[PDB]
Amino acid sequence: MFENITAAPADPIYGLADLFRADERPGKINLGLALYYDETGKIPVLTSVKKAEQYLLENETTKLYLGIDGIPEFGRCTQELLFGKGSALINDKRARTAQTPGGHGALRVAADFLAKNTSVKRVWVYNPSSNCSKSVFNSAGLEVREYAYYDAENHTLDFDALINSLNEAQAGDVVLFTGCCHNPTGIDPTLEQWQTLAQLSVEKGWLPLFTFFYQGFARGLEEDAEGLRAFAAMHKELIVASSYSKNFGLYNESVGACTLVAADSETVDRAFSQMKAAIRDNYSSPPAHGASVVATILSNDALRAIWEQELTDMRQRIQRMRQLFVNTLQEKGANRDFSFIIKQNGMFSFSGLTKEQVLRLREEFGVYAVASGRVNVAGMTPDNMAPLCEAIVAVL
């Protein structure tokens, strides 16, 4: 059977990454991944995670499944992180959380659940995007539609264009919003803007869906969820797909969460069961190590605090790197005003390199940036920052 099978590789994941590993070159730099690096170039394990794994190691007695909502405070702490401690949603027991596969695993659960149990017809996605989000809603059989989310001349959000595009979004549709750090501009809506949105949302009858993979990498933990909370304040229903693989550096452990918010206690429990069993329909049982590390760190006041600090540490090094990046480019002789990189959010920078300019960095300088022009500012160090800009100022 296996004889006439065709090969496969091309995928710019293992691709523009193992290709880097097999680039037999001197000072080659890797700005094309989505990991946090410290100043020496390594990718540490959070010490708050290391300590948490220690507690598991000599307190575990069984290694059995307790269900998808069976890990103690995973669900409870997840909601506290999203909606705020003391949030009316959590008092009125209006949310419910399930563990899912890493990152995309959550968004796939939501889609599969949305299809099996609601007459939802269309899902509105942001454009430009990175196409990833589009295929998932299709493979469950929901049509996807684009809305305009991009920047103006002044490197600001074209917020009018956002609304206009979303005009045709019918009620009983689903709209996807990135909670924070919006690949591909790094530009997130002002607080005033989120409320204008949420008000339009509740008015025109959308079912909002939030992705949340980089919580804490914009301004802070509680501040990045300002948008989401603005929605929850006057919404009856919404779905939220979160992910701990970035903010916990449990990269490989694939720890994701789907969170269902319905009108009242009963309505959500009834629905959550369909979701719960929509997961049993699929990818079998979920990984339990990652969910436990998270739960342990979040449910105890002391570890939670160390981890809070470690995260901030990461953010601040990145915010610092953005500065050094802009400055170096200026003094290495770029003409263009790159003062906008500073106002960008999260791990990435978008100077808008052409798809050629990007390839000429790889091929001619060994600087690896994603095909689009996304550069991982978190992989920049004071050591490699300098030839980095040279390569980039030479490409123009």
Next chain:
Amino acid sequence: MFENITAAPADPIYGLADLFRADERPGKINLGLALYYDETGKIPVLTSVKKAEQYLLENETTKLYLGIDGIPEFGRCTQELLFGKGSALINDKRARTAQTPGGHGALRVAADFLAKNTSVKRVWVYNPSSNCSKSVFNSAGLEVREYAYYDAENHTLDFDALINSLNEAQAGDVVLFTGCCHNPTGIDPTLEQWQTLAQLSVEKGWLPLFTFFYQGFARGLEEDAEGLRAFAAMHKELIVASSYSKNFGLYNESVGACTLVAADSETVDRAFSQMKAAIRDNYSSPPAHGASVVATILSNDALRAIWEQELTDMRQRIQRMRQLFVNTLQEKGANRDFSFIIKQNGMFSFSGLTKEQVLRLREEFGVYAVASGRVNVAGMTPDNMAPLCEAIVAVL
């Protein structure tokens, strides 16, 4: 949207399990699950696992994904366990192993891969079964067919009936075989019989597919794979879906494997890539904790040996329990000769309780067995063995 959503529960998994937990009764017994219990009624973690987790705890530095074949010796050790060390398959680099979700995750990969890349039309399943296997091959769009695998008057395999049923199995079809401990009779093919099968297989042109979730729970590690190895000895291709969640007691950690065996080095690598990317097509990245614990235990000669012992320990307690079970029933006044339970394989026993007799045990005695009549002999202890049989001799 969520208002007119219907409830869901019924599933005899969380069902006849949490229903046990909420049975407010005295000496209630739970023979309806698939876990190993020690003599005090608890479900330990393998000490060989505990030591392995320690090694990971202070030797890990990154927590990144290395790919589906990225964990060092996971794949290499998996094949050694299946085909034997020094096996011609492993020298000729003819196999390739990928990590998958727990248990069913492997079998779903194989199906999805089989569909996307081969003109395979039918999958032959054993009947009677527990229906689980059937839905999987469907949801990838392969038609499934039944073959006869059951017992005679004398509690032996009706091996002729097996063959006869498999007569119409066309070439370029896939036949599924349970490697060992065959739910639902506990009767596995004699070595002589496996070869007769394998010979028929190579003759009539089937693509064999082996499931292997209980390796080591029959007679021993190397012996349970006699059947599989007999096939491999003269086969050109086959797929094997293994699972570590039982023999490692990594119940929650969901550690599964799919193994692709092709004609030669090149053919397999080309094909394995389609499989590899058929996994990226879906359930996202796989859990890495469980694969690492296994890899650690298997790749080092010392831990491997402790774990070898722990497994045997489980088997022997179970084989011992079978005895006590038969004897007690005899002296508690059953008339029927239950001497056949002794020759049964794995964790389960099949006295063939009626679907009423099973329910009357739950409702009238608090003895929880699966709706079919499968009893988990591994959940029997010298303490609960006695009222257990009373309940069963009273119902029978």
